[PDB]
Structure 1
């Protein structure tokens, strides 16, 4: 590095412990050597004398390359080299007939070393966070591999010999540039954890269904356009995440055959309708995430058999109404309907006794329906950026309500029943048309945060507000407060609280 400045050239001008450890290991005849985290740049050639070593740990060092003397350690079974500057490996490692695990994570390998392809005794190989761009056909020699992780590389395709590794249990090729998965992957019937996330896959091979023991399949953030029907044979899958793909439809028998499916994610896809099938397809999932899609209608009776479903996310969709059986979702706990074209909430919402978190922000709601107070277990209610005009008096029955958000709404006055929310700790009233606050606001002992900024008609605050001893954070920005002295207003929230407390009757 040099700098061509001022019409000239300028430049940025600014192992005894290892030897002792090697001598100690030789004297003690130890079968394990740990030289990790020692800032070693060049490994001493004297290590060749330690022929009895079976485990060598050189990770977290500055090794540019390993000396050829390492090949004399024929008894090595574990070789840890993660977090180094290795660019290649010596060919002398062929003598390591007993090597079973090789760790090469976080290195500077531009390609898999040729000597690694000859270490047929390896059962676990780590190649994460390297610069590898291709996998040679010599991978077939490593038939004994059971764990292969080559994620965080620049691999664009996998050789057809990957299907000859019948002993593979976990295959990690995530965060690569793969565009197609060879059909030979179905020959590795012992694979239980296959990771394909953050790739450029366009489709999955029809032989993926031969992985009867597969339990984890990562397909999020790809270019998949459809799911093959053979995936239904993988009944051992626990979660099916398809976030950020081009999938728009699913096989009818896919979700039904996934008896062990506990969660389903279809976010950031091209779905315009719910997957075709009966209610039985959702009978096993605990959570259903279908946000950022273009779904406009929820089918009637879709969740009739979904007794276990508790979380539903429909954020950022094209919903304009709700199904007539909306009140039958008695098992619902958290419901997210934010960023939709909903204009009203049906009166059947009173039947959601188990509901605890309800989000209805960024909608076209104008009034909360009567019967909303039946939600005894409701804890969080979000109504930010709506067209609400007034709040129903039934809101006083939300004893378990803890957080209430009403930012960016056309509310003018608050009901006098808001003082019964003894568990309320957060109250966001910013950007509203509040002329004044009710005197009952002072009974909220647990209220900790109150937001009142950007209210143009809030000319005065009730004296009962000082009774909130737990009130720590308050926003009063841009408020006129014409009924209070300007000095106290300019002093800050603490000055306003002190003035209210001193003048309190």
Structure 2
């Protein structure tokens, strides 16, 4: 079958030498059996127990009939002919048979026969893999048949299983080594003893077989016809045995000096450049040096298929066949900005059809190990946002230039600096960046982001890296930043009075920065209009008067802090358009906060607030408000003065009764009252047009107290 490739050249030569020696053995045996005789004649005069050997001549007569000739020849042949010459063909036959047995014993031993057949078959079908040729075709990738992809995946699995199963055995090598050694030693024996005894084949033989009572003679001389022929046959046989021994020594040295238990594949990965080709362990690399002696092409083809880069490409082609464009545009979803976005999570790579999703607007990556980005992403022109999460993705120069002028927002969440690609700074049209993952590492701080300056158009910079310091580079790029945002996730952000350098900062948001106060740099940042200081642990905030520097100060947030009182100086902060001070420890409300006549949106939930002053109606321009989880017990009438108010959130308070003045508020749309000890509700609450039952967040039992007309009105307003 395929066993021809197992045998090296020196196996063919030895097999044919064995065939020739077996043939001469058979011919010698069949000739020696039916025709070998020994013609003996008596010696009349015997000198020194040996034959004397000393009118027309006459024939001597010995008075012996033919039957006596037969008897004496038989006896002389039986006793006085060397057993070496008599049994030559059978000895040669035995030597050839045992040589054949040693040659093919492993072929007939079922322990290793399974390994041999499995290895040769798998090598054949891997040399027959169309994927192997395509792997060296590149020495851009095409497409693999989905069925051929399945076949190649199954072949990969079977090859890995066979490697693990066979690299551990280590018996075939031992068997062939033993066979080689046995062949060498047996050749040595049959070249020593045969040549030692070869002179014993003589044409004439003197036998004194000591038979007189039946013959009357003592010594006899005999001619054996086949002595010349048998000597020639023995010479040819021992010459062939010498050749066999030469082959045995060659094979033994080749196997011993090579040390072929490990195969390095040192040329193929140096020529095809596939470093991901692992070396072969014992009982396997010997099987591969054998094939190399037959043909190294099979070795190269099999090593290419054992390569891991080949595995990556085959798996990527399987994925490319696996995904379809229609289902991709089906799964495309609206992101937090309601733009067409599909989060790429738990995916090793990217199918090649998805790069036809030209309508993609926002992208999100997650758990993708360094996927290659072909310029086919250039089809996805609308992609203005990207969310990088734990992915060291790799792009191509056309795709790089495409995303340079097609990306305006970006969101990086890297577990390491290497996960952020180096050519991101060439994407200079980027204006919104969202960084995550610690880059404030020791002795390499802010070195990679030194290229953030080069993003000249960077205008929104969201940072979550436990920033304990404001970088000089981030400060310099921040002079043209319109909105900077830093999330210290509990770490103490420090500015070293360098935040004031970013004068053109139109908005700023610091989350969990543990500032506990507002330095003069923030006040010196006059362009701030939207500001947040969440989880800064602020205790005293009376310095917000310096926020008067912010002439167009609109939104101010100091929520999630230790704040327990509100400065009277916030009265001079009339510019405040939006405010968010929840999750603090404030217990009262001062009359000065009501001077922020531009205030429109508010949130002061989860505080110890216990009353609502009469000047709340002075803040008419409010439209949304949240005061959940406080100590408010009654609704003052002035609270109902804010007619243009639309949304409310007043949960988890100690309120007990609801004044009918809530009916005065016509513009109300949503209101939260769940978490309060109310018993009866005024009917006027159901006279607000924009307010509906869905807008009215309140307990069901209190709603049952209202007239059924109010219930019907709320439901029928909810219907349309």
Which TM-score tier does this pair reach, normalised by the shorter chain?
Answer: 0.5 to 0.7
Aligned 1:20-59 pairs, distance under 5 A: none
Query: CA separation in 2, counterparts of 1:473 and 1:275?
Result: 54
Match in the other structure for 2:644: 400
Aligned 1:448-459 pairs, distance under 5 A: 448-449=692-693, 450-453=696-699
Query: CA separation in 2, counterparts of 1:473 and 1:407?
Result: 26
Query: CA separation in 1, counterparts of 2:147 and 2:413?
Result: 25
Match in the other structure for 1:387: 631
**Offset at 1:416?**
3.5
Taking structure 1 as the reference length, what is the TM-score of the superposition? 0.57
Which one has the bigger helix percentage? Answer: 2
Match in the other structure for 1:261: 505
Q: 2:436 aligns with which of 190, 195, 198?
A: 198
> Judging changes above 3 Å, is the alpha-carbon distance between structure 1 residues 471 and 222 closer, same or farther for their aligned structure 2 residues?
same
Secondary structure at the aligned position of 2:571 is classed as: helix
Q: Which segments of 5 or more consecutive residues in structure 1 lack a partner in the other structure? A: 1-41, 49-54, 65-83, 89-104, 111-125, 136-146, 159-164, 475-505
Match in the other structure for 1:78: none
Cα-Cα RMSD: 4.8
1:289 matched to 2:289: no
**Offset at 1:197?**
1.3
CA deviations on 1:247-279 (whole Å, 9 max, x unpaired) are: 524435533322332221211223222234362
Q: Which moved more, 1:172-181 or 1:303-312?
A: 172-181
Aligned 1:147-186 pairs, distance under 5 A: 151-155=388-392, 174-179=412-417
Match in the other structure for 2:283: none
1:429 matched to 2:673: yes
Q: 2:467 aligns with which of 194, 216, 224?
A: 224
1:233 matched to 2:464: no
Taking structure 2 as the reference length, what is the TM-score of the superposition? 0.41
Aligned 1:138-153 pairs, distance under 5 A: 151-153=388-390
CA deviations on 1:146-186 (whole Å, 9 max, x unpaired) are: x9x99445549x9xxxxxx9xx969979332225899xx89
Match in the other structure for 2:602: 358
Kindly name which structure, 1 or 2, has the bigger radius of gyration based on alpha carbons.
2
Q: What number of residue pairs does the alignment pair up?
A: 349
**Offset at 1:292?**
2.6
Q: Is the 8 A contact 2:493 2:513 kept in 1?
A: no
Query: CA separation in 1, counterparts of 2:460 and 2:417?
Result: 17
Secondary structure at the aligned position of 1:241 is classed as: strand
> Judging changes above 3 Å, is the alpha-carbon distance between structure 1 residues 470 and 398 closer, same or farther for their aligned structure 2 residues?
farther
Query: CA separation in 2, counterparts of 1:289 and 1:359?
Result: 13
Q: Select the structure with the greater relative contact order (CA < 8 A; seq sep ≥ 6).
A: 2
**Offset at 1:444?**
2.8
Secondary structure at the aligned position of 2:512 is classed as: coil
Q: Is the 8 A contact 1:216 1:237 kept in 2?
A: yes
Q: 1:369 aligns with which of 613, 619, 623?
A: 613
Secondary structure at the aligned position of 1:220 is classed as: strand
Aligned 1:239-388 pairs, distance under 5 A: 239-245=483-489, 247-251=491-495, 253-277=497-521, 279-281=523-525, 283-298=526-541, 299-388=543-632
**Offset at 1:242?**
0.8
**Offset at 1:400?**
0.6
> Judging changes above 3 Å, is the alpha-carbon distance between structure 1 residues 418 and 249 closer, same or farther for their aligned structure 2 residues?
same
Q: Is the 8 A contact 2:507 2:530 kept in 1?
A: yes
Q: Is the 8 A contact 2:651 2:675 kept in 1?
A: yes
**Offset at 1:441?**
3.2
**Offset at 1:196?**
6.7
Query: CA separation in 2, counterparts of 1:221 and 1:132?
Result: 22
